């Protein structure tokens, strides 16, 4: 086991500088503070000599505010000087109440420190491919090159020859400043159509279904998970992936601790400890923790067949409607009352690829969705009794005939699962039918992934469906690719093929560049463009580390991330905070919004020099000198309620921030919105929610059924608690990499014995899409025939075995993946030290 051998830590002194910090990482947006103080000072164990006013010569008790782990301490540059830093979770933040996950608690230790040698992989200088290798250079040189090639390609072939891949998310590697900066560059200065998002290969919404119905996906508050009678958790492994939401809000409900709260806010109705329905093919640690906290009788784990959620929800909707377990007044008052006729190709297809499902009235939707319990039990593999029980935990009135309060929460098991549009809609149908939107203890919400921080110009020009960018690239189209804060080599679908082609096309441009004179920049530009005209690709990567896709790029531009800059984002409750900068960017690294502005400025210069003065003038409006300038040009001018929000006002509100949208500013507080749709007026032109007539149609995405039928195992995929995303930071964190040097593939021990595998064996997963590697981890809770591989991982990429298959709106169907498995090596010595024991807590 990895052990730091750090025996003591510097003590935060009483006069340390305090900074408000939201967690860099997941959607929960846990509150923290960063305390910094000079390198040659320290605090003392006496109360007056430390930030806590506690005597630190004594053992603190459980849940103390007056302790931090070594992963919470570092030394960092701040205004050119080394300072101590502690980044510690905030006890007074209502999101986390002082909980810090395994990820957030390592913010300090995954910061850049020269003094303590952490994250020495961080990028410090612009890099250009020249003289046969990547070489460091100045900003002026690298941006000049990027702009010259970009401007020439776009002037000769149009903006369609510019391909963009960029984050659209919040938190570190995103945020309002940074989504605005990039958005303004590509959607205001230009009209880039061939743009994709960091997690999906087209410029689309993950949840077109709920949005078209009039229900924005983040409509409740985290208190609603405390107040619900029943939590319905679909395709979420919340303990691992929305950890402190689960621990600080769901668990109190399951344990009965929120009963006093429920009784106070909701006096005219009965209350019991929360029950929870978990819809996931796999038994997770989240299932286990629910059982241990609530008791097995209060947890309904519906272990459906992969990809059959839509059948379950349509049966539940059918049963609840037929029992009349619905909110008749909500339906009459708030939902669309005149249904409309099915499109001609229904039920197999919608009116076009833009509209895979049919929006209508409650009654029409019930008849369109109609599916018996027995049919749903066949498709899902669930027992009829389990489905009936679930309908009861959702719809059946409480004693006195009071409405059951149900929070419906869903994440990537649904969004990246079968038939995204219809399955999203079918779940929303349930919440609408039961009046569980805009009221306490309700919601039909994304549980989320990253924090959210999106503000951009109109994307009307991208179309719907939008372009399938990876398929353009694989097919030899496009000329220049700008990549901002995503690494398709680890995380795209059909990743093996993507990599083969990307390498070849970028190699053309590299071979041309190594043979041309650099000091003659016009010759270099011309040689690059000739290679592009032959089918090559010129690629520019904006990131904070050397990425996998970066190994194919020609220019690398170093970014500064959250904490090295000021940054705004909102959590899964819409709670907007300001993370206040507490350290300096490594080397010459620069916030993404400012990269974008500098690139715009360079585009203006070069286009002017080329004589296209009208095109050049489109790149104005980027005189920003600090990230607050982008905040003010973006969020402050364009968000609803934006006038009310400034960095100074956000700062005054601390880690609790306010819930968007802002409705006013009075007495130093931004006034927010605790829940959406409280008046029952929905996000449609007439104010009514629509239901969705959304019949089951099997595995919707191309090739999926054939993939299932022709391979041995389900290769389910997703997150581990210990790993953040593609391990971009974690790869230089021994605590993480000592635990999993390879990605795990959870396998049932009988399956392993049948395939001749032993624990720790390195195995190849393969199918029609490609091949990859993983380490067999024996998992007694896995069902026979069903495996789970950690996604996004640099030492074995799961996406290599995902097909190119998407829905009509170009949503990637990563979860429905099947393949074969065969041994590559006996368990290597570098996994001899690992525990292969169960991840489930035992009381």
């Amino acid at each position: 086991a990895f052990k730091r051998h750090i025996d003591r830590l510097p003590i935060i002194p009483a006069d340390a500088k305090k900074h408000n910090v939201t967690c860099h990482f997941c959607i929960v947006g846990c509150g923290y503070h960063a305390y910094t103080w000079p390198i040659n000072k320290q605090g003392g164990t006496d109360p007056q000599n430390n930030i806590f006013g506690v005597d630190l010569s004594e053992q603190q008790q459980a849940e103390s505010d007056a302790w931090y782990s070594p992963s919470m301490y570092n030394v960092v540059k701040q205004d050119g000087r080394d300072v101590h830093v502690v980044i510690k979770p905030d006890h007074e933040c209502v999101v986390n109440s002082g909980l810090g996950s395994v990820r957030g608690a390592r913010m300090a230790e995954t910061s850049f420190s020269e003094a303590r040698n952490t994250q020495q992989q961080r990028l410090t200088d612009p890099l250009v491919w020249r003289y046969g290798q990547m070489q460091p250079t100045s900003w002026d040189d690298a941006l000049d090159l990027v702009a010259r090639v970009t401007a020439k390609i776009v002037k000769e072939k149009g903006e369609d020859a510019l391909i963009v891949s960029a984050f659209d998310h919040g938190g570190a590697g995103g945020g309002y400043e940074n989504t605005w900066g990039t958005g303004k560059l590509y959607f205001e200065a230009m009209k880039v159509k061939n743009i994709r998002i960091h997690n999906r290969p087209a410029y689309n919404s993950e949840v077109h279904g709920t949005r078209d119905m009039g229900v924005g996906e983040l409509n409740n508050c985290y208190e609603d998970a405390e107040l619900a009678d029943t939590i319905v958790a679909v395709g979420t492994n919340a303990l691992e992936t929305q950890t402190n939401y689960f621990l600080n809000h769901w668990i109190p409900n399951l344990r009965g601790e929120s009963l006093g709260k429920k009784k106070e806010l909701m006096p005219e109705e009965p209350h019991e400890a929360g029950r929870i329905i978990i819809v996931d093919p796999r038994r997770t640690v989240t299932v286990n923790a629910c059982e241990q906290t609530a008791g097995a009788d209060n947890v309904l784990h519906l272990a459906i067949n992969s990809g059959t959620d839509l059948a379950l929800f349509n049966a539940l909707f059918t049963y609840i409607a037929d029992k009349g377990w619905v909110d008749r007044d909500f339906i009459d008052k708030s939902t669309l009352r005149e249904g409309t006729a099915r499109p001609p190709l229904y039920p197999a297809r919608g009116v076009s690829e833009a509209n895979p499902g049919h929006l209508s009235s409650f009654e029409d939707a019930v008849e369109g969705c109609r599916m018996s319990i027995e049919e749903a039990a066949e498709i899902t593999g669930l027992d009829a009794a389990q489905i009936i029980k679930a309908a009861e935990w959702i719809g059946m009135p409480k004693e006195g005939g009071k409405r059951r309060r149900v929070m419906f929460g869903y994440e990537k098991g649904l969004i990246w699962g079968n038939d995204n549009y219809r399955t999203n809609g079918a779940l929303v149908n349930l919440a609408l039918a039961t009046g569980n939107i805009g009221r306490p203890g309700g919601g039909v919400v994304r549980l989320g992934g990253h924090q959210e921080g999106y503000v951009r110009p109109s994307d009307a020009h991208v179309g719907r469906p939008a372009a399938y960018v990876d398929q353009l690239l694989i097919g030899g189209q496009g000329g220049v690719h700008h990549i901002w804060g995503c690494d398709h080599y680890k995380t795209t679908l059909n990743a093996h093929e993507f990599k083969r082609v990307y390498k070849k096309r970028t190699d053309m441009v590299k071979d041309a560049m190594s043979a041309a004179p650099y000091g003659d920049r016009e010759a270099m530009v011309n040689a690059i463009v000739d290679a592009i005209n032959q089918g090559g690709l010129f690629a520019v990567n904006v990131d904070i580390i050397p990425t996998k896709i970066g190994e194919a790029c020609h220019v690398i531009l170093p970014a500064a991330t959250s904490g090295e800059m000021n940054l705004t984002s909102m959590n899964g409750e819409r709670r907007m905070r300001l993370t206040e900068r507490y350290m300096d960017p490594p080397g010459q690294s620069m916030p993404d919004c400012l990269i974008a502005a500098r690139l715009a400025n360079t585009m203006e210069r070069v286009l002017t020099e080329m004589g296209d003065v009208g095109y050049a003038a489109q790149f104005k409006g980027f005189d920003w000198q600090t990230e607050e300038d982008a905040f003010m040009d973006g969020y402050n001018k364009n968000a609803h309620g934006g006038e009310f929000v400034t960095y100074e006002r956000l700062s005054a509100m601390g880690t609790n921030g306010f819930q968007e949208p802002a409705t006013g500013f009075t007495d130093g507080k931004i006034e927010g919105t605790q829940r959406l749709y409280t008046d029952g007026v929905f996000s449609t032109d007439d104010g009514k929610a629509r239901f969705m007539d959304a019949p089951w149609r099997g595995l919707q995405a191309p090739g999926k059924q054939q993939q299932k039928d022709s391979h041995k195992y389900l290769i389910n995929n997703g997150r581990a608690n210990v790993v953040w995303q593609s391990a971009y930071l974690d790869q230089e964190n021994d605590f993480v990499m000592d635990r999993f040097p390879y990605p795990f593939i959870e396998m049932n021990p009988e399956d392993m014995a049948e395939a001749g595998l032993k624990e720790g064996d390195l195995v190849e997963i393969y199918n029609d899409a490609g091949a990859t590697q993983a380490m067999a981890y024996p998992t007694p809770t896995a069902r026979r025939g069903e495996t789970f591989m950690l996604f996004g991982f640099p030492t074995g990429v799961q996406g290599n075995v995902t097909s190119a298959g998407t829905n009509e709106l170009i949503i990637p169907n990563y979860k429905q993946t099947w393949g074969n498995i065969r041994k590559i090596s006996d368990a290597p010595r570098n996994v001899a030290h690992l525990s292969f024991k169960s991840k489930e807590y035992q009381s």
Binding site: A1, F2, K3, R4, H5, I6, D7, R8, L9, I11, L56, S57, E58, Q59, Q60, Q61, A62, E63, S64, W67, Y68, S69, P70, S71, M72, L99, S101, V102, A105, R106, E109, L239, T243, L247, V285, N288, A289, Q292, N721, V722, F735, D738, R739, H833, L834, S835, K837, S838, K839, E840, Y841, Q842, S843
Partner: protein, 132 residues
């Protein structure tokens, strides 16, 4: 004084321990609870003739709840937020919320069977220095 000065403290005698049953202990002072545990197989940090005696903090490095030991499993388990630690692999967090593997004692068995502790390999929950 560059490093922490750990006291060498007698915790028990080899004789006192039974296979797979923790014995409560405290190191490096009375306020830092932990256990000796004889595991029946040679393991990392394990002392005695069989190299199977380990000592660990039993206070969770996440938020400080006390860890229970499952004999069936030979794991430590946290009722706070469901962490699991493997004392047969150096206290590796099998799954959990701590950013630390379980602090493990550096043990020495004296010529008479007495078991001394003279260091710990990680920062014990609730102290900013392991020797207070």
């Amino acid at each position: 004084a560059a490093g922490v000065e750990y006291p060498a403290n007698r915790l028990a005698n080899i004789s006192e321990l039974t296979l797979n049953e923790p014995l409560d202990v405290a190191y490096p002072d009375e306020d830092a609870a932990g256990v000796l545990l004889k595991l029946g197989t040679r393991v990392e940090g394990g002392v005695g003739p069989d190299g199977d005696i380990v000592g660990f903090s039993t206070i969770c490095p996440h938020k400080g709840f006390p860890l229970s030991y499952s004999a069936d499993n030979k794991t430590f388990n946290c009722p706070g937020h469901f962490s699991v630690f493997d004392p047969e692999k150096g206290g590796q967090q099998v799954w959990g919320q701590a950013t630390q593997n379980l602090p493990q004692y550096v043990l020495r068995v004296a010529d008479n069977g007495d078991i001394f502790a003279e260091g710990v390999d990680e920062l014990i929950y609730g102290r900013l220095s392991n020797v207070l």
